[PDB]
């Protein structure tokens with residue numbers, strides 16, 4: 435599996451791609467049989483077409499920005515967790531959402547599972 | 561209480577950090593379900609049940625000199641789960657150290673911690 439140091443780099447790269455809005459590059463980071471639970475508690479999304487559609491819905495408009503708010507925490511079994519903030523629009527107003535993603539990677543360095551922890555308690559209107 | 565709401569998860573997980581910070585091992589253990597599992601660090605074998613969990617915390621905190629604080633808000637779900645970032649400050653090998661951690665917790669229908677997973681490794685340790 436990817437080393438702890440490699441997990442930190444991969445998870446940081448993911449946030450960079452979200453921040454620039456490169457949907458195709460994001461989808462390429464995922465394994466074929468990957469699942470996305472975003473927000474955690476909702477049914478998993480699976481399939482590359484479905485994951486692409488998910489990121490199109492969220493990022494296609496542009497005007498989404500994302501940045502790490504602390505270091506990536508990485509394990510020795512190919513997993514990590516990271517805190518970040520998303521800037522977006524809600525009800526036509528600028529808002530911020532605080533999120534933690536948990537990721538497991540496969541032996542090819544691709545995302546096998548992603549779980550995103552957030553709810554309305556993590557939303558701020560600006 | 562019942563299965564915690566997102567707000568309640570935020571309060572429970574914040575109280576957990578306060579208990580680590582003060583080092584009240586028996587109060588920490590009470591927050592766990594009787595048959596809870598802890599994986600700390602994630603990737604190592606799970607610890608099962610309050611006796612083992614108490615032994616684990618007494619090894620980690622019984623020496624005193626540990627301080628913990630949240631470094632950002634608790635993230636909570638609507639199915640009794642949450643995740644939080646925090647920093648632990650300790651003294652080791654004659655050096656003040658800091659460890660950055662994220663804990664993920666799942667709560668049961670009585671408001672007790674059913675599972676805890678702690679994400680960290682040596683890449684998250686800073687010595688002085």
Ligand SMILES: [Cl-]
Pocket residue numbers: 503504505517631632645646660
């Ligand atoms: Cl942090």
Ligand SMILES: [Cl-]
Pocket residue numbers: 503504517518532631632633645
């Ligand atoms: Cl944060």
Ligand SMILES: [Mg+2]
Pocket residue numbers: 593668
């Ligand atoms: Mg039970």
